[PDB]
Nucleic acid binder design. Structure first.
Length: 205
RNA sequence: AACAGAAUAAGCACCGGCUAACUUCGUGCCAGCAGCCGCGGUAAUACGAAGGGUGCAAGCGUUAAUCGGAAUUACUGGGCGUAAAGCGCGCGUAGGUGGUUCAGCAAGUUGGAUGUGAAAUCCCCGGGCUCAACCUGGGAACUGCAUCCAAAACUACUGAGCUAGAGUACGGUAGAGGGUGGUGGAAUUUCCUGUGUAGCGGUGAAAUGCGUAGAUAUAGGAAGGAACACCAGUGGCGAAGGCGACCACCUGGACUGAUACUGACACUGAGGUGCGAAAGCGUGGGGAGCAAACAGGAUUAGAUACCCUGGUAGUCCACGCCGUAAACGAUGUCGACUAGCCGUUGGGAUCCUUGAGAUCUUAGUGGCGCAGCUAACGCGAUAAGUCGACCGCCUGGGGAGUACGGCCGCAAGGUUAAAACUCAAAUGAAUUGACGGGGGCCCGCACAAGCGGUGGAGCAUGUGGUUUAAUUCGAAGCAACGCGAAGAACCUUACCUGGCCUUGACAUGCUGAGAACUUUCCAGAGAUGGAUUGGUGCCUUCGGGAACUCAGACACAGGUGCUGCAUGGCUGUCGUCAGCUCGUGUCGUGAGAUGUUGGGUUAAGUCCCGUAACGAGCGCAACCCUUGUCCUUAGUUACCAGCACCUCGGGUGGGCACUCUAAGGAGACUGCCGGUGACAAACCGGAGGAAGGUGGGGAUGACGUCAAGUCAUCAUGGCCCUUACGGCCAGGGCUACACACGUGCUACAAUGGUCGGUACAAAGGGUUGCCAAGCCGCGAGGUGGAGCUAAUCCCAUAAAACCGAUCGUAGUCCGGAUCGCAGUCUGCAACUCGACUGCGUGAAGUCGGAAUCGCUAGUAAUCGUGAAUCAGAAUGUCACGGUG
């Protein structure tokens, strides 16, 4: 059922989030670094929303480009968090670490940034649909050509597992030529676990 | 009037919907609640409490009892085609209603006057008690009944007329309208007679039956009984039931024309009177076929039934009875108005006349249709439309058209016709689905063609069952059982038996202690306990800090414990099936519907032509990968055509032709030819071409379904354990074992079996590894250490095929299970419990029931090779090639 919309297009649309060659004797000693970096960084940067954390390995050290749509929260008073983490990313990843920060201008057209706001609204006890009818039209005044948002879970009920489904525009999924974003962020309410899926469709080719 | 002092004085029901007003806590299909809907199975806004809140107040609630709401007994104010409801049809008494002109009358009717309709009560305007209830003055009202006066439209009564309703007299047609006799022809059966000789008859198929004691067939004859082909029709006639041979005989009514007469003589009809299909009943006839009851055969778990062979009352006639039917147009009779068109019976017209004529008009009988009505379906001059006159009948479902009583009947029975009790529903028309042993088109190894297996035997593997101290859980039709598990000697591992811990194996905070480290030691199955040379760091505001390790105490830690029906995540399934929806618009009272149907076509909701719909999305197609052709760029470790070289090995120099490798491109679009279609999609052929009509394969599975599976991968709501349901360590266990089922491998031999030679692959792994040459071993191997970080080195010898030999179809020079003995390898350790090797022994098995599965071409069938997991261990899983 609906094979993951990145794993079919690694190639014709998108590329990896981490590029580095490794021998067969060190391949599984760089993965375990790069997988507990991403669990570390998102638990620290719970605010100052983060979409993508890329990692390059040049000759013998590192490079990391953390993407936020609000860089001023992370770079606060000239890198009081930047040099503080750069001391302490080396303690998990023994090479010296670079940290680079870009902007995510138009923050309402990347799926991770959108779906983090859905968990925020649905844990403030906002209505399950008034939160989302406004979170699609706002992401259609500027930008995209199609948006699907599925909201599944407890949805407040007693024994209820309904799925909200609202769509606008055009979203293909069996065209490999197209360009689709995808993100699943969850939510822990005072009862039940709500999972949210987002299918922002940018332009094709 | 004075004194005292805020002192002397607030409950009751309810809070899920109707219905104003809400959340926590107990409880868990228990107790309990309730005016109806109905709540309660472990999170209850409905039960019990607690806060809060709403209604009313000196009262608030329940029960009982009437009228409202109830247009639910409908006078004002309902109904009867299908929801309950039109008698089976006539005739007719009492009664109800009355066409049209005058004239009279005044019984109804209207207007007025008088007498009355007790007072109170109700209503209106006032007046008294500090207000109000309460008391009270004046008026209206009491709808009525009676007596007088007047008016005269309508009804009644009376008197006279009129002909439009109704009836009579006269021509004239059409008819299965009745009753009483008579007479036919075809066919069936029984009987007689001739010829002739082996079956007839029956049915999914048979059997009972009938036959040489001469059947069926076939010809001749006789007797008898009932029905009346073709004409024959939405056709006729009758009050309805009903009525079909031809003729005579009596006999009723309808149509149509002309003309005179009577002058309202009419309509309906409670009671009462008649005619009442068929089955049945009584007495007498009559007995061809058909046929309940019955008998036998068959089918059948069973078959009184369907089907088969027989067969009686009855059906037929006369006379008498019974009175019901889906007695149907599910529609009482009678009268008047309201657009059309196409039929048909019979009858007059007019009309040019030859008509296969024309138009108009009545009496019937059919098909469509506008207004209109209808819940809808549907009726629509033969109303269910608009209106009149009289009658019958209906009041939720069962109980029940039933019981008692009455009247009729020879009998069966019929007609008239209740109640108690019990339920919150019974029923109507129309929608979307689902389903059919209903119909129409289409597609799939779905059948049919073909090859090969499963179930027979042996071993391998899983589940059920059994058993044990534990055989740790989970997955139960296809969708399950070589399944999580891509590896159980211990470890894994959860379970069992013990040994052993309590802030803990681990997290953070607190208090002390020492750097960490190294201790090379004993006890003990180990866990652990105690020795134990040593070590004394590290940054120093030199104060210490941080680092680690030990103890104390608190919050806690931890959980493979329950819930997959509290859920997220991730996968199966229908199904790679061709569908699934929306916007705006119009139709419908509404749930809906249309687009998305029709014709053609397609692997396809793919296209074309059509069309109250016009569009859009998801899907299909393409975009991606791989294989097949060629071109360009590229030449080491790959490559050898040309060149020498050679020791004859691309060995070497060399070459960039090639094969190969991998980058980037072209090629295929029904493009072109012909035919075919509406010439429009497309379809059938044809050329060229490496490839021809989506070239072959792969990934890609729509809206959804099954509360499908998983809390034991992980994440989480709740619930329990927290001196153990948590931790630690030994051995055991999951591999036990009369049995049954699932997949899988070998075999059962001569398209074979051995021995000796000899030929050709792809794909992949390897510096914590591959482990060569030499070397020693019957053999698995042991030495030995190269080469190697990979087109180089190693894994690494492909097997079937071919060639020669023997083997002669024998449970075997077949088959290899079992088992004895002897070895090597990994690992601390091969007892329960590993894999291989040697030697010996040699089983079942001679192609395998009912059944049942896979496959349409490099495919089935058969032969090998590699990888993942991995110290060791594949008949499985995944993957690549031979022969075909």
């Amino acid at each position: 059922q609906k094979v993951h919309p990145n794993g079919i297009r690694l190639g014709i649309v998108k590329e990896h989030t981490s590029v580095w060659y490794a021998d067969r004797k060190n391949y599984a000693d760089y993965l375990f670094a790069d997988l507990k970096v991403r669990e570390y960084l998102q638990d620290k940067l719970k605010s100052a929303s983060v979409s993508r954390i890329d990692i390059h390995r040049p000759a013998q050290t590192a490079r990391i480009t953390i993407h936020t749509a609000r860089p001023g929260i992370v770079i606060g008073k000239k890198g009081e968090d930047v040099e503080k983490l750069r001391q302490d990313l080396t303690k998990q990843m023994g090479v010296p670490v670079h940290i680079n920060i870009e902007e995510i201008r138009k923050p309402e057209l990347d799926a991770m940034l959108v779906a983090q706001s859905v968990a925020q609204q649905l844990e403030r006890r906002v209505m399950f649909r008034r939160a989302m009818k406004r979170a699609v039209q706002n992401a259609m005044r500027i930008g995209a050509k199609g948006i699907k948002i599925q909201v599944s879970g407890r949805l407040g009920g007693a024994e209820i597992a309904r799925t909200e489904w609202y769509r606008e525009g055009r979203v293909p999924l069996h065209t490999l030529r197209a360009d689709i974003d995808y993100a699943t962020y969850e939510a822990h309410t005072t009862y039940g676990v709500i999972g949210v899926k987002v299918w922002i469709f940018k332009g094709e080719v």
